[PDB]
Structure 1
Amino acid sequence: GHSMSQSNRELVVDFLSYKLSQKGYSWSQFSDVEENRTEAPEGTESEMETPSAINGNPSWHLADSPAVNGATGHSSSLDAREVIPMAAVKQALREAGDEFELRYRRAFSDLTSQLHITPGTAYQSFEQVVNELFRDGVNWGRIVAFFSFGGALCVESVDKEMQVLVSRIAAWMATYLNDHLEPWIQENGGWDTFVELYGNNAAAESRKGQER
Structure 2
Amino acid sequence: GHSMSQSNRELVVDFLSYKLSQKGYSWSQFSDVEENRTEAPEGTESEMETPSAINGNPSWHLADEPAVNGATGHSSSLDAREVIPMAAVKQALREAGDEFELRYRRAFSDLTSQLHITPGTAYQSFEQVVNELFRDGVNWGRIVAFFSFGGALCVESVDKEMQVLVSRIAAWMATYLNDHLEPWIQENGGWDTFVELYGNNAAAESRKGQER
Q: Decide: shared fold, TM above 0.5.
A: yes
For 2:152, the equivalent position in structure 1 comes to 152
* Residue 87 to residue 73, structure 1, CA distance change in 2 (3 Å): closer
Q: Give the secondary-structure state (helix, strand or coil) at the position aligned to 1:117.
A: coil
| Alpha-carbon offset, residue 113 of structure 1 | 5.6
CA distance in 1, matches of 2:203, 2:60: 73
| Alpha-carbon offset, residue 104 of structure 1 | 2.4
CA distance in 2, matches of 1:71, 1:203: 17
Q: Give the secondary-structure state (helix, strand or coil) at the position aligned to 1:158.
A: coil
| Alpha-carbon offset, residue 189 of structure 1 | 3.2
| Alpha-carbon offset, residue 73 of structure 1 | 23
Contact 1:188–1:200, Cα closer than 8 Å, also in 2: no
Structure showing greater radius of gyration is: 1
| Higher deviation after alignment, 171-180 or 63-72 | 63-72
* Residue 159 to residue 56, structure 1, CA distance change in 2 (3 Å): closer
If the length of structure 2 is used for normalisation, what is the TM-score? 0.55
| Higher deviation after alignment, 111-120 or 150-159 | 111-120
| Higher deviation after alignment, 105-114 or 78-87 | 78-87
| Alpha-carbon offset, residue 166 of structure 1 | 0.5
Give the unaligned 5+ runs of structure 1.
none
Instruction: Count residues with an aligned counterpart.
Output: 212
* Residue 162 to residue 136, structure 1, CA distance change in 2 (3 Å): same
Contact 1:97–1:144, Cα closer than 8 Å, also in 2: yes
| Higher deviation after alignment, 30-39 or 202-211 | 202-211
Percent of paired sites with the same residue: 100
| Alpha-carbon offset, residue 153 of structure 1 | 1.7
| Higher deviation after alignment, 125-134 or 92-101 | 125-134
Q: Give the secondary-structure state (helix, strand or coil) at the position aligned to 2:152.
A: helix
| Alpha-carbon offset, residue 122 of structure 1 | 0.8
| Higher deviation after alignment, 91-100 or 72-81 | 72-81
Q: Which has the higher helix share?
A: 1
| Alpha-carbon offset, residue 175 of structure 1 | 2.0
Contact 1:150–1:173, Cα closer than 8 Å, also in 2: yes
